[PDB]
Amino acid sequence: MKVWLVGAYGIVSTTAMVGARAIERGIAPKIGLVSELPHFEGIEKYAPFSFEFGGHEIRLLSNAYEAAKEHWELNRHFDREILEAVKSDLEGIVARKGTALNCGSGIKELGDIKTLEGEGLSLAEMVSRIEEDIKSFADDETVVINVASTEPLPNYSEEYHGSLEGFERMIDEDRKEYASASMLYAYAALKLGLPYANFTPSPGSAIPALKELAEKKGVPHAGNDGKTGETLVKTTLAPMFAYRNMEVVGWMSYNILGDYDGKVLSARDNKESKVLSADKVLEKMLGYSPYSITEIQYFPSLVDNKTAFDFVHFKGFLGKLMKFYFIWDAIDAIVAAPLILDIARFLLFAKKKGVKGVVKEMAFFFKSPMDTNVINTHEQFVVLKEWYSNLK
Amino acid sequence: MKVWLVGAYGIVSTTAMVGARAIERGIAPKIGLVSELPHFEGIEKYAPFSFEFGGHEIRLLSNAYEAAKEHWELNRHFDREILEAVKSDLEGIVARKGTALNCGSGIKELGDIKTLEGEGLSLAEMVSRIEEDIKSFADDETVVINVASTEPLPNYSEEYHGSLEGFERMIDEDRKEYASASMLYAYAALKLGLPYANFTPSPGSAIPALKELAEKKGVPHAGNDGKTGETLVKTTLAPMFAYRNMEVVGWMSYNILGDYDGKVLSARDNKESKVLSADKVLEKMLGYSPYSITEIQYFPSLVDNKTAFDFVHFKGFLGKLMKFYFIWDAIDAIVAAPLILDIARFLLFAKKKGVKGVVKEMAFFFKSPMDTNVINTHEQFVVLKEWYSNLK
Amino acid sequence: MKVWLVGAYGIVSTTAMVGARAIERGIAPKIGLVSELPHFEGIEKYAPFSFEFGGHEIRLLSNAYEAAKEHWELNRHFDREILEAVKSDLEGIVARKGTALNCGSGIKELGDIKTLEGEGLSLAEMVSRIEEDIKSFADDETVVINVASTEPLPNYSEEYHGSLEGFERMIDEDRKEYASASMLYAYAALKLGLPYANFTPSPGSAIPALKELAEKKGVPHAGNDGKTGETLVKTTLAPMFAYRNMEVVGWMSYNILGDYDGKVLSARDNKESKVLSADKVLEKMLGYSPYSITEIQYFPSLVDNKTAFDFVHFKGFLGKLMKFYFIWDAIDAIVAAPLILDIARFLLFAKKKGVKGVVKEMAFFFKSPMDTNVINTHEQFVVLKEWYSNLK
Amino acid sequence: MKVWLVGAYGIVSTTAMVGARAIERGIAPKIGLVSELPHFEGIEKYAPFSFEFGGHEIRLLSNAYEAAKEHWELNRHFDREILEAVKSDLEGIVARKGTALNCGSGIKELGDIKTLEGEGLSLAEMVSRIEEDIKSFADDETVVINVASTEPLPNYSEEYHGSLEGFERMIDEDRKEYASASMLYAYAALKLGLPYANFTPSPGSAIPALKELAEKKGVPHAGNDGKTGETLVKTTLAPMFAYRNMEVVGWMSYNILGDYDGKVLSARDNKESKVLSADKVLEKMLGYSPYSITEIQYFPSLVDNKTAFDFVHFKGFLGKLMKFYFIWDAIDAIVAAPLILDIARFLLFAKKKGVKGVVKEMAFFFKSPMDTNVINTHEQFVVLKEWYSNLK
């Protein structure tokens, strides 16, 4: 299959790519890959473990190996022997210039960039560029996945976001103020008939205009926001207090990371997307609102080794308060990369089984799952096993 | 309803008793009580929230208030106002002398004791004493719950444990070597037709002889070993790594507590019951065996504020290792006491709905659930909701 | 001795007062009191353990017992038996209306207040009120200690802060914009010849104008900002990495607390004082600057049980990075209250031994110690033992 | 200078050796090296940073590179580029067969071994072998350092350990029962006039017989037991509670590690040396005894990444209890290796300045410092700076 990755030179994207090749060549195991769990035995009928890559970027690099090597040099998150072994393959992956339209002050932190809007292009002329890039690449086993830096909350609009005719009136009118890059790549993927998933908390396809598009076109789509680390523990651990009839009175989450993702999210406007996609979640599981703080702070020595500290204060019998603490030390790109591969495969599956519109049943992968109030990791894994069973 | 509690002067038992009265008088909330969750709306038809208490003890105290006050003085785990309010009621709860038969070197740590075997009695004469105590107390809404100190592994016997005729040949023969106190109270409860649960990891009713008894007599029973704190997190958190196709390569659990339970478990022979009821659990959820250490150490300053430190080391994508830590700070008797009340109510329910034999469906409450390989807290809560739905 | 406490109805102040009486009546031990360590044997010649209290407040309460009881009700940070025992004594402690001048947006969080400036008074007329309150109270064994909510950074001024003639030209001119409440109480204490310490990070006496005053008047003074919890660990633990020739590359401190102090510091302008009095400290011990973040977030369930989470990332041999974590769970008022008593006693001592100006040698008590680059807790404890030895 | 290392193929030893060469070739920094702190400017007059290595081993390997590579393969605790760069130099380091005499059941865990006693040799004939190995190597700038696996407590003897004439009567008599390998290498180093340090908690030179020897021969010696990680925090952090007049009521230390050191210490008899060299330390700083547990458990996934979890429970004002937690994640060989280099250099220094007998002033490096009750890391660093100042 083919996968077009927006943000193709990022750490998640490049580590998905390193990983795919390394497993393909049989020099790495298949751990971390949900689509390789036994209950999904049979998936390789529809989405075999075979990948070719392309994508959009705004940072300047020769190819995807150079990009992979840049993150590796800092993180050493896979062996030098893997890098060497996948070099050749990754050198032939060359991203295309995308659009950083309304992608926040955070984008400054990425250094050297070049974008389509900086060429002067109108919305319609950018859309055309994006679609040309993908369609030239795409086939009938192609999926577009967004793994680009998180954008701030978009400029509000019922007219331009509320319907597909309204969204297309935006492009027609060249009303840049209401378009964000991630809306345009999602728009482009769906107009071309390709499945789309958003691994970031940027709006993407989560606006009505694009939900309506995906359905008309009969195209499956999923998101938003990969649930990979702290929030996975949170949606796995919060249920417990509910099952035991306890009140969570406060829950603190503090995350520190560096590298590009930590840099970008170091901006106030970009940060806001991720902190509000991480605060309403307790309520969806407990039905009420504990005092819940969630913070991201930049901390450069850690690079992609995002580390989180949470503290859960909770009432139990007689209303006596008690305490729980945890700490997560993992590299974000390792928890994230095989999920891109699973999501893709599950997308191809769903496309082949005639699925269209939000694949709500893929909530298991995401912090802000579209078109569903099922947040509890256990309930989401069941919904996912049962979804796939019904369609196999 | 009535509840006969073995170890009636313990902290769990006395805090169940304080709590029951305090809620009865409407001066405490119903938090921590699973039987009060909305899905169990309707239970109060069969097991209303109304309790009268009795039990067996070996430590010497005037009544259950004096006992409650002793633990309170050290722990202050509920308000002074509650204690005062429940005093009168608890002063009229007077335990009966039980049996510490083959209950380990740990029993020394409890100080002043007196037991039936120390009167010289044979097995048959002790059995008679125990049954006389309970039957005089019991009615048709009576349940017997074991909350006594944890016993070591019992002396092995196919003949005497393997069948009810064989177990009764033990009593007949006065073969003390093969009987443990907790087998005799379980034997007595079931011979009298009362439901029984074991909140401790001592054998209790978990031997074939007594499983066969409960069935013949048409009596429901549940256990073993209340899952209240660290192990609840463990069976709630371990699934996550499985759902995400990760390998847990090692898992460390270290617990420190004091007070009587920490004292008794400070012995090598008594400790062994609890550490082996806490080590095989990962396998039942993951299907393989991480390196898993589980320790209990005495630490007197903590009293009943058992605190646990766990560390989970796990492989993910490409086999990169990563780390998770947690720490649990809670008072054991607060996490444990409403469960005694739930278990009782669920026992009365099950009795009334004609249930007999192991109530496997109550696995949710226990670390060593009898007659079931369902350990995952999520799966156990579902099995419990569905059990009760089918019978309501 | 007498102690006038600014913020006399706060938790620190009231718990110093509860504690002093409880020890006086011999119903509490002398733990937490540095002035009671054996190397300070002999201090009771100059500052016996005997206290009478007064102070300034802006929150409305009948007396210091009602105030003590308010914090106790929420925190239960000492026994009910102590409260009862010290009631009478504390009921006869009645604060006087002070001034909240330029004390930040945070002051809103304290609810019901009344202040001198709200009566309309000029600077000179407020100064007069403050001095009248204290002088009526004071004797020759009186010390004034500031334990009031933290103020934001004051409005900058060389003219009005730079000299005593300049500061007094401020009062004369009624230039409120450049005066903060804590400058006026410090000004008043020193004009009356009383020793002063600042337990908060508000400017207090730490401006040149007031340093010059204290010297002229021959009056000892100390500050700023009680080092009681996290920062005590930080100045005790940071040296270690230096002694071992390691580079600290990043150090994260995150604090969560509630109650009034957490409320007030919940404001952006008030928070700023405490976060900049907690960030430059590493450099003073290591001589360079690790990436250091320090945050305070409001978290109401904790009340005065401020809890902190720090993470220290550091290079060692060959430049390999390694990790250290800690967590502090303590009630702030317990760590803070005996220090008020020590500081006072050490102030009276110093006054009697003819000491004047900044008592740099009391750095051991403070996060921002005036007139000294000695931050390392070990070095500060030595400087303090040696100071007192030289004067005894 | 030359350094003879007992246990020359261990991770500490080989990483000291990798490190020394890598710094020598100017491809690594001098971090972690206490002898390179500015207060020891001038040391390179007496002990320049220049090293040649030799040592005794019992595990079978071709040279010190193969040994270094074995630990590296598992731990990757320095770059591949360093290994390659130091290869040649390390290939020419070939250990000599030593003695595992009375070195515990733990020694089984090391796999393939060969030892002098297994050749049949008497004590006198082994001593001769050991001395021949070292003397052939030694010069006038040679030091012998013990970095071999920890031995159990030795078989008790006043006669044979109590005096040098008595110890030599042991060798003479061939009374193996009372000799441990580490006593014989220490005996040999000192008879040859070489300085000796013990980086392990095995007796070494810490018996009177060998203390008397070192003095007669005018030879400096130091130990025991490198204080590198958890215990360094403990002797840095414990003072704080004392300075603040608090009572530590309990202190828990739990360590988990793997690799050879964790394997060997996995034995009950070997473990005992390290747990009793880690329990009496609090008293030497606080003057009383908190409840203190200290444990080591094997945990193979961690290899040399020893991780520790401590919990400190302590009374403060009014006797209110409060809590502190910490966790140490570091690789033991990184914290340990430059100390071998410092200790050596400080040994050569001391030898040249005519120092003889225990160098008590090197306590700073060790968990069980000989001939001194100075345990507090701050006080030990001062004693060390002042020692060196007095002699420079």
Ligand SMILES: NC(=O)c1ccc[n+]([C@@H]2O[C@H](COP(=O)([O-])OP(=O)(O)OC[C@H]3O[C@@H](n4cnc5c(N)ncnc54)[C@H](O)[C@@H]3O)[C@@H](O)[C@H]2O)c1
């Ligand atoms: N565990 C995780 O790594 C995790 C979890 C949840 C969500 N995410 C989201 O995944 C995304 C990528 O994560 P990462 O850690 O690889 O970050 P990264 O910054 O290294 O990668 C993002 C890449 O996208 C590029 N980019 C930014 N805006 C773009 C645009 N509008 N068009 C085309 N390219 C653009 C950047 O140049 C960069 O190369 C981030 O939004 C992150 O928040 C990551």
Ligand SMILES: NC(=O)c1ccc[n+]([C@@H]2O[C@H](COP(=O)([O-])OP(=O)(O)OC[C@H]3O[C@@H](n4cnc5c(N)ncnc54)[C@H](O)[C@@H]3O)[C@@H](O)[C@H]2O)c1
């Ligand atoms: N969260 C929890 O508190 C928790 C969790 C799981 C299991 N448990 C089990 O619950 C039991 C009670 O816990 P606790 O903390 O109240 O301990 P506890 O020691 O205070 O109470 C046990 C009581 O039983 C009595 N006893 C001991 N052996 C007896 C015998 N054979 N016959 C009659 N009485 C006997 C003791 O005297 C004591 O009063 C222990 O086995 C414990 O391991 C507790």
Ligand SMILES: NC(=O)c1ccc[n+]([C@@H]2O[C@H](COP(=O)([O-])OP(=O)(O)OC[C@H]3O[C@@H](n4cnc5c(N)ncnc54)[C@H](O)[C@@H]3O)[C@@H](O)[C@H]2O)c1
């Ligand atoms: N461990 C600690 O508790 C700790 C450590 C370092 C510094 N401090 C500082 O101590 C101070 C008091 O701490 P707390 O926890 O008791 O807080 P608190 O809010 O309960 O007490 C402060 C009291 O001062 C009063 N106040 C505020 N501004 C005033 C003004 N300008 N004039 C007169 N009264 C005023 C408030 O009404 C309140 O009653 C805070 O600044 C705090 O930041 C506390």
Ligand SMILES: NC(=O)c1ccc[n+]([C@@H]2O[C@H](COP(=O)([O-])OP(=O)(O)OC[C@H]3O[C@@H](n4cnc5c(N)ncnc54)[C@H](O)[C@@H]3O)[C@@H](O)[C@H]2O)c1
């Ligand atoms: N931070 C630390 O690494 C640390 C801290 C304090 C003490 N120590 C002590 O340092 C010693 C070495 O630590 P390591 O982690 O390198 O362990 P390691 O097991 O890898 O190295 C010890 C080496 O000594 C050899 N050996 C064992 N007994 C011997 C004998 N009697 N004669 C000659 N060789 C022998 C072993 O074969 C091995 O190669 C251990 O005692 C350890 O407890 C280490």
Ligand code: NA
């Ligand atoms: Na870690």
Ligand code: NA
């Ligand atoms: Na705690």
